[PDB]
Amino acid sequence: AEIDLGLPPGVQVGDLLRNEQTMGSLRQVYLLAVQANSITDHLKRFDAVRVPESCRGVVEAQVAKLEAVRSVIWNTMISLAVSGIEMDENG
Amino acid sequence: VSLRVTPRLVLEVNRHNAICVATNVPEFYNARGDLNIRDLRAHVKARMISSQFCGYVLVSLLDSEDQVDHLNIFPHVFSERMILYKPNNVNLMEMCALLSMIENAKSPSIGLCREVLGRLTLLHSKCNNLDSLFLYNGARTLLSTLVKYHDLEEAATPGPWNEGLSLFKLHKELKRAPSEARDLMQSLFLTSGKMGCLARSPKDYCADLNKEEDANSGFTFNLFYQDSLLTKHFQCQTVLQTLRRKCLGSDTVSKIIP
């Protein structure tokens, strides 16, 4: 190549930068994952807490907002899953 | 930031008249986690003086290819990555041995981990070499993967580990998610079809892998590994095929990165 890097047998350059592309994309996916999982933990707390009476509408709408954001998150993950499938030659 | 190659699937390979066996290095430590350096080093010396010793079979993986129990790699590339190592050096030999022992450690305590990293840095200080820098970085990386995944550091103040194999963080994070979404997301990000199916129990797959190719060849490959978060790729049939092929013929190298 243009700069010698200590590389073991299998590793050529093209694999090595392809690696960086995929590591970026899945880095985003991981951020989305831990986000969706914090939100789903807050959901667990709401749904477990019980005791709603007349304050129930506020609680139901806060659950509604959480669940809504989380749906958008999971769909974003799907949406770049498919894109990564578009880069590949077999799919 | 992740241009790092890491050695995976490290076993040691023996051949007694074309009858071949790839084994993990046995555990050299007690139930509390005291690393038996004396017996380990005697093992390594013994494997050097031996004549039925061919070397450590190892593979080189990139971070985005290792999905914990599936491989986002093509089979030809995978074959180019897998080598048969027999270094003309005792310390590199023992480093590969510790790599084997980390991958196949049943459930190490962080005490065994810190001892193992310690012995490793001590060996790597003895050998300035691209092979020792390689063996060391990757062995520390396997160590760190094991701690971060199993919560062995939890203490609060950081130890000298790193993030480990990246997709292992993804693997752990998706097991946490609602059962509904977890299944799909595992199917979409960490189940790469490219290396094909998994066999139910490798040992049987190698036994009939012997039945098929044993008229022309007296060659007989057997595999011994301890099941572990770091050895799940011994379930993959293409893996086992490539492994038998590499162990039975090919060549050896005295230097990984000459």
Author numbering:
A (entry chain H): 41 to 131
B (entry chain A): 20 to 173, 175 to 278
Q: Paper's wording?
A:
BBRF2 is an EBV tegument protein that has putative homologues in all three herpesvirus subfamilies. Here, we report crystal structures of BBRF2 alone and in complex with BSRF1. These data elucidate the molecular basis of the functional association between BBRF2 and BSRF1, suggesting a role of BBRF2-BSRF1 in tethering EBV nucleocapsids to the Golgi membrane during secondary envelopment.
In the asymmetric unit, BBRF2Δ and BSRF1Δ formed a 6:6 heterododecamer. Using the PISA server, we found a predominantly large interface area of ~1300 Å2 between BBRF2Δ-1 and BSRF1Δ-1, which we think mediates the constitutive heterodimer observed in solution. Three constitutive heterodimers are associated in a symmetric manner to build up a triangular 3:3 heterohexamer. The antiparallel ɑ6 and ɑ7 of BBRF2Δ join at the middle of ɑA and ɑB of BSRF1Δ, forming a tight heterogeneous four-helix bundle. A massive hydrophobic network stabilizes this helical bundle and constitutes the major interface of the BBRF2Δ-BSRF1Δ complex. In addition, the N-terminal loop (N-loop) of BSRF1Δ winds toward the central β-sheet of BBRF2Δ, and a bulged 47-LPPGV-51 motif from the N-loop lies inside a hydrophobic groove.
